[PDB]
Amino acid sequence: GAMAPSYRVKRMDIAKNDEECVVNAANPRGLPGDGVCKAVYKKWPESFKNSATPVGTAKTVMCGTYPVIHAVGPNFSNYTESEGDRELAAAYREVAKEVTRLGVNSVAIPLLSTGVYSGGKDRLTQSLNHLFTAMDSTDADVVIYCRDKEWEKKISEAIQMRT
């Protein structure tokens, strides 16, 4: 584990992360997709062999020895708010189990269900709160990746408030 487990946020492409493993914001079918998923496909295409997995789950596939944890958040266009909330919390719990199993000291993670699966709603606080609920009991250094300047400030504020 990390000597003093922390949370940090960076505004940049997660395909350029400096962590021991990455979480992909995957679709259930293991397709190249869009947004984070397409960037992950371009950087680690080998990790998409048999990566299909249901909503609310995570499946890790190695690219060389680098682990890519495919985490499938719900598409809020299809789920109700209550069911989508439950599946989003479940996807993050599965990410925590995989990060623990892998023995890594750091992980790069995006906010699941905040892009094209958001159903057109701002889900920063909802998604980040489920990320903290799952990851708080792990000892890996967590680095959250985002692309928007206002989101970077809000995520940074949420991390700092708890310290």
Q: Pull the structure tokens for residue 59.
A: 């499946």
30 is in an annotated binding site: no
Number of residues that bind Cl ion (CB under 5 A): 8
Report the residue count for the chain. Answer: 163
Rounded Cα distance between 113 and 26, Å, is 10
- What is the number of the residue whose Cβ is closest to Cl ion? 115
Q: Is 13 in the site for Cl ion (CB under 5 A)?
A: yes
CA distances from 76 to 3, 42, 99, 120, 134 (A): 37, 26, 25, 8, 20
Q: Quick check: 92 binds Cl ion (CB under 5 A)?
A: no
Q: Does 131 bind Cl ion (CB under 5 A)?
A: no
- Taking CB under 5 A as the rule, does residue 115 contact Cl ion? yes
Find the part of the chain contacting Cl ion (CB under 5 A) among 82-90, 114-122, 133-141, 154-162.
114-122
Q: Return the range that interacts with Cl ion (CB under 5 A); candidates 38-46, 48-56, 82-90, 142-150.
A: 142-150
Q: Does 28 bind Cl ion (CB under 5 A)?
A: no
Among residues 46, 136, 148, 157, which is the contact residue for Cl ion, using CB under 5 A?
148
The answer to whether 112 and 135 have CB atoms below 8 angstroms apart is no
Whether residue 60 contacts residue 67, with contact meaning beta carbons closer than 8 Å, is answered with: yes
**Cα 128 to Cα 60: distance, rounded to the nearest angstrom:** 21
What are the binding residues for ADP-D-ribose? Answer: 13, 27, 35, 115-117
Enumerate binding residues for Cl ion (CB under 5 A).
Answer: 12-13, 115, 117, 146-148, 151
